[PDB]
Each structure stands twice: as structure tokens, then as C-alpha cells.
Design a protein around this ligand. Structure first.
Ligand SMILES: OC[C@@H]1O[C@@H](OC[C@@H]2O[C@@H](OC[C@@H]3O[C@@H](O)[C@H](O)[C@H]3O)[C@H](O)[C@H]2O)[C@H](O)[C@H]1O
Ligand code: CA
Length: 415
């Protein structure tokens, strides 16, 4: 008799897994029907923005932690605190505190107070390597604790870059990193960031940032340890990693089902190479599961969010289907130690969460437009047509204007 709309995003394997788990919810609650709206990850922001702009908000939906404050100011997210407290058996205290706190807001600041969502997951972005490739090449395996230096990383990547079938053409490469998702770790481990400590000033013109960005671009253009510009256009580097053509590529827990299906070589996880700080860095992602402030069925909507986020049955199903690591800390710790479940160094995911993982800079700001502007015109740097130094000088004032506007807009919307 009750109908809920559940809006979310995922790669094909994630869509299938969540659709399966929603069906399990519907078996458990036969009086609730869940109507699904699902998109690809890149489509999602646009489609959710449109829903909110028209005030036709789905009952339950994914959202970005960087939108939490804006969504509260505009009365988008229901305060679900009391529903979560009253629910049978639920124990959020078992869930990653880092995850739960991203969706708490006390009226002034994030991290404390009322719950406005539940964590879908934590998404530590690890570095994988192709063990099959290393062993066929006779290269000593990477250490699972001590990061490569940047120069050591380039050195091994060069050794891996070769013509393996002897037709005279390179057909295997050290790596092929996507700047959108992998620049951050090089920037951070080199002691830089997109913004200052106060999160109000753009700092991409820091020499440490420039060094990190130029190093990144140089992997393709100078050190030549990646497919060429044309080769990556022909077949993108994620696909080339699946086919066993690349030595190194990132791995998120959401990748595991796709990798189970398509990757035939042995791979394992390692820390990211470290810049001047000598400490590895990468991001820990998260999405929240929120409830529409205007839902006609808040109890059932929170029950769906809880089933996906915290319920041991719903959680076990998601972990079994290899699209995330457990939200329960104790379950995650014994998961990581189970050697029958690969990669062998699953533990690296937990090390990222507990130690060297950072948030995206936009998680700190009222909106992300300032950061999107950095990436919007970045490709000429990546393709060697413009220096890192020249680009960040040009981008910085455009970014700063947008950031200033985000800051002002928060002041206005929170009045
Ligand atoms: O193009 C290959 C894909 O890109 C890289 O992933 C980057 C993006 O991460 C996934 O989203 C993960 C979720 O967002 C996190 O905040 C949350 O913790 C996760 O559930 C998107 O599907 C990707 O576009 C990887 O190399 C590969 O998956
Ligand atoms: Ca060849």
C-alpha cells in the first residue's frame, strides 16, 4: 500500500547489487513498494539538482556530503534522528564514526548534532598493481607498507613499459592515471592542497601544488610511462587496466565486483607513492543516503535508508556482492583479515580510512563550483600544451571568485 521512490547512482554492477538488496527489503516489508530511479555516476548530480529545483524530491536518495549544509538550509533533507533512535536493534555506534558524522549537522557545523542522512559507505581509493605483470617481468614486488618515492615509481613504471609481443610497438605501460581521481594524492603527499587551512583561499599556485601537477602530467608526456594521448583516446586507461595492459591503477571497493568479473591477472593493493612529505595520501569518498523532508512516509523511508546503511542483513548482501566494504567497523576488520577474500592486502582500504585518507576539498565548502572550474580547463596541462605553472595562475582568480561566492551564499542562505 505504501510506495517509496529511491533515487541513486552506480556503475552497472552497483545498480544490480542495490536493486537486489531493495528486493530483499521489499520481501521483509511486503507493504512497501520501492520505485527506482537510477543513473550513471556522472549523470547523477544533474538529475538530482533538477529534482530539487522543481521541489519533486525522491523519498530516499544518494547525496554528496559537500551538499549537506546547502540541503539543510533549503529544507531538502529530513531530520531523521528520532526515527533512527527508535528503530529496532539499530546501532549506529557500530558504523564508521567518520561515515556517520559526515551527515550530522547541529545548525552551525557538520559532524555533530542531528542526523540528516546515513552513510552509504566509506570509499577509500587505494592503489592496485598487476602482480602477474611484475612477476613475468622479474621486477621485485612493491612493498605493502613503505611507499615508493616519486622517482622510484617512475623507475618501475619505465621498466614495465614495453613491447611484449615483439611487433615493435609498446603494448604494456607502467600506468595511466586519471587526474580527476588520482591527482589529489600527489598534491597532498607533496604538502599542498587546492585551498588553505581555513578553506577560504585558493592555493593551487603554491609551488608544491605546481610540482605535483607537473609531475602528474609528466607521467604521460615526459617520462612516457602511460599509453599515448591517442592510445588513451582509443581505449581508456580503466579499460586497459582490466585487460592487463597496465602495471598500476587505482582500486575502490566499488570496483571489486567488476574486477571479479573482468580481471584475469593477479593484483594487490599498496600505498600510493609519496612526495616530499614521505607519507602516502589519497581520498576517502562517501555518499549519504537521505530522506526527503517532504516524504509522506518518513518511517518507511528511514527504514529503507537503514536497511542499506546499517542493517546487518542489507549490509551483508552488499558486501557479498562486492560493491563495498562493511559499514560496521568490527565486521570490516574481520573481513580484511579473511585471506580467502582478495585482494590479499584488503587491509590497505582500512589503513586509508584510519590513517592516510583525506576528504575532497569540496567537502569543506558550501558548493563545489570553484573546484569544478579547476578541472574544467585542465586537459591542456595534462596533454603537455600548457605548463602547470601557467594554468594555475590563470585558473586561480576564477576559482577564488567562485569560492568567495560560495562563502557569501552560505551566509545568505543560512540567515
Ligand atoms: O573510470 C573508472 C572509475 O573511476 C574511478 O572511480 C572514481 C569514481 O568513484 C565512483 O564512485 C564511488 C562512490 O563515491 C564515493 O564518494 C563513495 O564512497 C563511493 O560509493 C564512481 O563510480 C567513479 O566515477 C575508479 O578508477 C573506477 O571505478
Ligand atoms: Ca607490441
Amino acid at each position: 500500500k505504501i510506495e517509496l521512490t529511491f533515487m541513486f547512482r552506480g556503475q552497472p554492477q552497483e545498480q544490480t547489487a542495490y536493486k537486489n538488496v531493495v528486493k530483499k527489503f521489499e520481501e521483509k516489508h511486503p507493504n512497501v513498494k520501492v520505485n527506482i530511479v537510477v543513473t550513471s555516476p556522472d549523470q547523477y548530480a544533474t538529475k538530482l539538482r533538477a529534482a530539487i529545483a522543481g521541489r519533486k524530491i525522491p523519498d530516499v536518495f544518494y547525496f554528496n556530503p559537500g551538499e549537506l549544509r546547502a540541503y539543510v538550509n533549503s529544507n531538502v533533507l529530513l531530520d531523521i534522528t528520532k526515527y533512527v533512535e527508535n528503530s529496532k536493534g539499530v546501532n549506529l555506534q557500530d558504523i564508521w564514526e567518520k561515515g556517520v558524522n559526515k551527515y550530522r549537522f547541529d545548525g552551525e557545523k557538520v559532524g555533530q548534532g542531528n542526523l540528516y542522512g546515513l552513510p552509504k559507505d566509506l570509499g577509500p581509493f587505494a592503489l592496485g598493481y598487476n602482480k602477474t605483470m611484475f612477476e613475468k617481468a622479474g621486477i621485485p614486488l612493491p612493498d605493502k607498507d613503505k611507499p615508493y618515492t616519486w622517482q622510484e615509481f617512475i623507475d618501475v613504471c619505465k621498466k614495465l613499459t614495453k613491447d611484449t609481443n615483439g611487433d615493435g610497438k609498446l603494448d604494456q605501460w607502467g600506468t595511466g592515471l586519471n587526474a580527476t581521481w588520482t591527482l589529489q594524492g600527489f598534491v597532498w603527499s607533496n604538502g599542498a592542497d587546492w585551498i588553505d587551512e581555513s578553506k577560504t583561499k585558493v592555493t593551487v599556485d603554491d609551488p608544491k601544488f605546481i610540482e605535483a601537477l607537473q609531475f602528474f602530467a609528466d607521467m604521460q608526456n615526459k617520462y612516457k610511462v602511460t599509453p599515448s594521448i591517442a592510445e588513451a583516446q582509443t581505449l581508456d586507461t580503466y579499460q586497459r587496466w582490466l585487460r592487463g595492459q597496465l602495471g598500476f591503477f587505482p582500486v575502490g571497493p566499488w570496483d571489486l565486483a567488476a574486477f571479479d568479473q573482468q580481471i584475469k591477472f593477479e593484483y594487490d593493493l599498496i600505498p600510493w607513492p609519496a612526495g616530499s612529505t614521505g607519507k602516502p595520501a589519497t581520498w576517502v569518498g562517501s555518499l549519504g543516503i537521505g530522506v526527503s523532508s517532504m516524504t509522506k512516509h518518513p518511517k518507511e523511508a528511514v527504514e529503507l535508508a537503514l536497511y542499506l546503511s546499517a542493517d546487518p542483513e542489507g549490509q551483508k548482501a552488499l558486501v557479498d556482492q562486492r560493491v563495498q566494504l562493511p559499514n560496521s567497523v568490527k565486521v570490516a576488520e574481520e573481513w580484511a583479515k579473511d585471506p580467502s577474500i582478495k585482494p590479499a592486502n584488503k587491509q590497505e582500504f582500512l589503513d586509508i580510512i584510519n590513517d592516510y585518507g583525506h576528504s575532497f576539498p569540496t567537502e569543506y565548502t558550501y558548493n563545489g563550483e570553484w573546484y569544478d572550474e579547476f578541472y574544467r580547463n585542465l586537459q591542456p596541462v595534462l596533454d603537455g600544451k600548457m605548463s602547470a605553472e601557467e594554468y594555475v595562475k590563470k585558473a586561480k582568480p576564477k576559482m577564488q571568485k567562485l569560492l568567495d561566492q560560495a562563502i557569501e551564499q552560505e551566509k545568505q542562505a543560512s540567515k
